[PDB]
Structures are given as C-alpha cells and as structure tokens.
Write a protein that binds this ligand. Sequence first.
Ligand SMILES: *[C@@H]1O[C@H](CO)[C@@H](O[C@@H]2O[C@H](CO)[C@@H](O[C@@H]3O[C@H](CO)[C@@H](O)[C@H](O)[C@@H]3O)[C@H](O)[C@H]2NC(C)=O)[C@H](O)[C@H]1NC(C)=O
Ligand SMILES: *[C@@H]1O[C@H](CO)[C@@H](O)[C@H](O)[C@H]1NC(C)=O
Ligand SMILES: *[C@@H]1O[C@H](CO)[C@@H](O)[C@H](O)[C@H]1NC(C)=O
Ligand SMILES: *[C@@H]1O[C@H](CO)[C@@H](O)[C@H](O)[C@H]1NC(C)=O
Ligand SMILES: *[C@@H]1O[C@H](CO)[C@@H](O)[C@H](O)[C@H]1NC(C)=O
Length: 396
Amino acid sequence: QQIGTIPEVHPKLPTWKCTTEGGCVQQNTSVVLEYLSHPIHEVGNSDVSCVVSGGLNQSLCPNEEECSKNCVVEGANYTSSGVHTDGDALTLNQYVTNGDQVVTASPRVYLLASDDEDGNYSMLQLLGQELSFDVDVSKLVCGMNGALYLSEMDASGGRNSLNPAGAQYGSGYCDAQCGVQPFINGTVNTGSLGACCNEMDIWEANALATALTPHPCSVTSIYACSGAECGSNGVCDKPGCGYNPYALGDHNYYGPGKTVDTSRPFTVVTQFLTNDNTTTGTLTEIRRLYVQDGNVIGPSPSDSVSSITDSFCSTVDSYFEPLGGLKEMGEALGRGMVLVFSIWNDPGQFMNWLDSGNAGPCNSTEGNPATIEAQHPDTAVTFSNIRWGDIGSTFQ
Ligand SMILES: *[C@@H]1O[C@H](CO)[C@@H](O[C@@H]2O[C@H](CO)[C@@H](O[C@@H]3O[C@H](CO)[C@@H](O)[C@H](O)[C@@H]3O)[C@H](O)[C@H]2NC(C)=O)[C@H](O)[C@H]1NC(C)=O
Ligand SMILES: *[C@@H]1O[C@H](CO)[C@@H](O)[C@H](O)[C@H]1NC(C)=O
Ligand SMILES: *[C@@H]1O[C@H](CO)[C@@H](O)[C@H](O)[C@H]1NC(C)=O
Ligand SMILES: *[C@@H]1O[C@H](CO)[C@@H](O)[C@H](O)[C@H]1NC(C)=O
Ligand SMILES: *[C@@H]1O[C@H](CO)[C@@H](O)[C@H](O)[C@H]1NC(C)=O
C-alpha cells in the first residue's frame, strides 16, 4: 500500500538514554499508531477500505503487488484514536466520545527514533541495562491492561517498495502471541499466518495487579507462523513466565493504599542483569524496583522469589527453557527491540489472568468490558519520564 496525502504527524515524546559517567541525555523520540489504526483504502475511493472485518479485502489485495497498487495508507487522527502527549508524558485512553456515543479506541503505539521519511523505530538494547518509567495507573480499573513492552519487530517495520510506509506508519507489529493479522512484516498475509517474535512484557497492569512476563520464541526477529507453529507451545511461548507479586505471596505489595500505592503515580525500574555485569554477558536475572515518595521499594520478602530467573520460570512455565530461557531472551534484548505502549480490555476472559483469582483482588465479572464502558469510560494510563541505560543510572 502506497502513502496517501493525509499527513502523518507523530505525537512527540522525548525519552532519555542514561549512563553512569555521562548521565541522562534526551532523545527527540516520537510515537506512532499501529498500521491498522491508519485509514487504508482504495486509491479511487476512501469509502472502500482495504482492511475489512479485520482481514484483507480480497478483491483489492489478492497479493502484495495488487494490494500495493490498489490501496493507500493515510495519516491518522491521534486524538480520535485515544493518544495524547504532553511534555514527556504519553496518555492512552481506552474510549473516545462523539457526544452520547462511546467508541472503543484502545490504541497501540511504537517509539520512533526519527520522523524522517525513512525513520526507524528506536531499537532499545537492554541486555545488561535497565529501563525506568513513571506511570499513573490510578484510572485503570479491573479488567483493564495498560502495557509497556518490547517486541523484536523489524527496525523499519517491513519497509520496501510495495510497503513504503514502514515504521513511519506503524508497520510490522509482532509479538509472542503469533496473532493472525492482514499484513506481516509489511507483506500481505493472504491466509492465516501469524506474526511471531520474541516479546518482553515489562509492564502489564491496572491499579489492582501487575505482571512482568518474558515470552521467548525459537526465532529471531519477526516470523510468519503456519499451523501448529502458531500454537501455544509452537515457535513462541504464548503463556510466558509471568511474575505477579500478588500471585507469588504478598497481597499487600501492589495496589490502592498498598506498599506500591497505585492510588497515585510511581516509578517502575526493570534491570536485565547479566552474569558478568556487562552488556554482552548472559541474561541471568530480571529484577524489579519501584520508587515512590522518594523511596526505593525492592522485591517483597513475602514473595516466594525476589526476581525472575530460569528456575523460577520453569516452575511457572515449562516451555520457557526449551525456547532458550533468559539467555536467548537477553540475546533478543541485545539485538534490539521496539518499545510498545498499549491500553486494552478483554471481552473473553476480562483480564482475570492479571487481576482476579490468585492473581489479584478483582471480582470475576468486575472487568467485563460492558461494565467498563458503561461505568468507567474515562479509563486511561499515563506513561512518562522514560529512561533506559546503565544499571542504576535511570532513577533517583
Ligand atoms: C521484514 O521486512 C523487511 C523489509 O522487506 C526485510 O528487510 C530487508 O531484507 C532484505 C533481505 O531479504 C534486504 O535485501 C537485501 O539487502 C542487502 C543489504 O545489504 C542487499 O545487499 C541484498 O542484495 C538484498 O537486496 C533488505 O535490505 C532489507 N531491508 C531493510 C529495510 O532492512 C526484513 O528482512 C524482513 N524480516 C524478516 C525477519 O523476514
Ligand atoms: C534533541 O533535539 C535537539 C535540538 O534539535 C538536539 O540538539 C539534540 O541533539 C537532540 N537529541 C539527540 C539525541 O539527538
Ligand atoms: C480528530 O477527531 C476529533 C474528534 O474525533 C476532532 O475534534 C478533531 O478535529 C479531529 N482532527 C482532525 C485533523 O480531523
Ligand atoms: C552486577 O550488578 C548488580 C546491580 O547492582 C550489583 O549489585 C552486583 O554487585 C554486580 N555484580 C555481580 C557479580 O552481581
Ligand atoms: C461480584 O461477583 C458476584 C458473583 O456472581 C456477582 O454477582 C457480582 O455482579 C459481582 N460484582 C460486580 C461484577 O461488580
């Protein structure tokens, strides 16, 4: 699909790269909506969409050349898609409103390194490094998921002559869920392939519960899976090695009025520690700290473990180590990965895996999207003050 005329204007979102000796240095980064959140329509006629019912218009897109000729991708309206930036803060709204009508926006955005015509995503290399961000989750109710994570997408988003849009229009998404989507790495997916790649879920959370989940794959960068390759233990680890402090033994660590008080903003620090403390060693531990009220809050001693390691993970996820465990996870982090921000909810299981049952305090039906939309249409997440770099150099 070629590039139409409605301009694509990326909300600016400064970030920081930090070092022990040099301190933090601001990057002129910005943020881009998912490709499929852009209008993609026929050259003649902006009423004829090329993506209908979440799949390809077969008349226009039987293959990549025909789709490239028949279709154009347009610039997106970021506010109607629920995306706002103010200084160093990104706000993602789940819902937007005409007047009486509420519209599911549920945006997903990617961090861009450049806004040039050939600008690529930022390729964060976090092996032997840390990432910190401030977050306000106080408006994220049961069933909501505000997420900040990493995917081994292609730095150009699959840019080529038939997909000239690339990273500048949000192209090339993939994750460990191997989801079926109409374009994979910038190429038309005519039939049922899934878009797979290593995924590091730094942050999935609402005000009631939080999870940190590495999801390894047996591939490097993006991969179109077929058949059983897309299964739950196929080329990727769909369940992943989930770390949730409520589930692991401390119901008073995280939440409203709790040790990490989600009633008000806080800082999330994630350290990817290597055996030899270098950015080229082997990832052997993932460690989580919070900062709130100028206090560093370490792992709860009431939790069964204090960090993610391979032996932890094998207790919760028997497919983590066959796909290379933390060593290959760290190799993906060392090659470089795309920073992804999203907000979403779940008409199927209501996020009960995140915040209900053993995992959190929510009533089983509290996170029904129907009640969320009726009662909490303003639910939203704000990420800010995003910094990555040398261990210890990104926070207080
Ligand atoms: C995802 O899609 C992108 C965009 O098509 C793929 O990137 C491209 O990969 C091809 C290889 O099939 C590269 O072509 C070759 O490039 C080298 C450059 O040194 C050239 O010497 C060769 O003669 C050949 O033309 C192309 O450069 C590259 N483009 C970009 C922007 O990186 C990518 O491979 C796909 N990823 C996966 C995992 O399939
Ligand atoms: C951010 O923008 C300013 C002004 O153009 C520039 O001086 C600075 O070098 C930029 N940051 C980076 C990392 O290039
Ligand atoms: C984007 O949409 C909102 C409402 O949906 C509207 O107020 C705004 O003017 C739109 N922007 C453009 C450029 O059309
Ligand atoms: C590696 O970095 C951590 C981070 O503070 C530090 O505590 C530790 O002493 C370093 N060395 C080893 C061998 O863990
Ligand atoms: C809490 O759970 C009970 C169990 O059936 C349910 O009847 C009630 O509606 C739930 N509360 C909500 C969804 O707010």
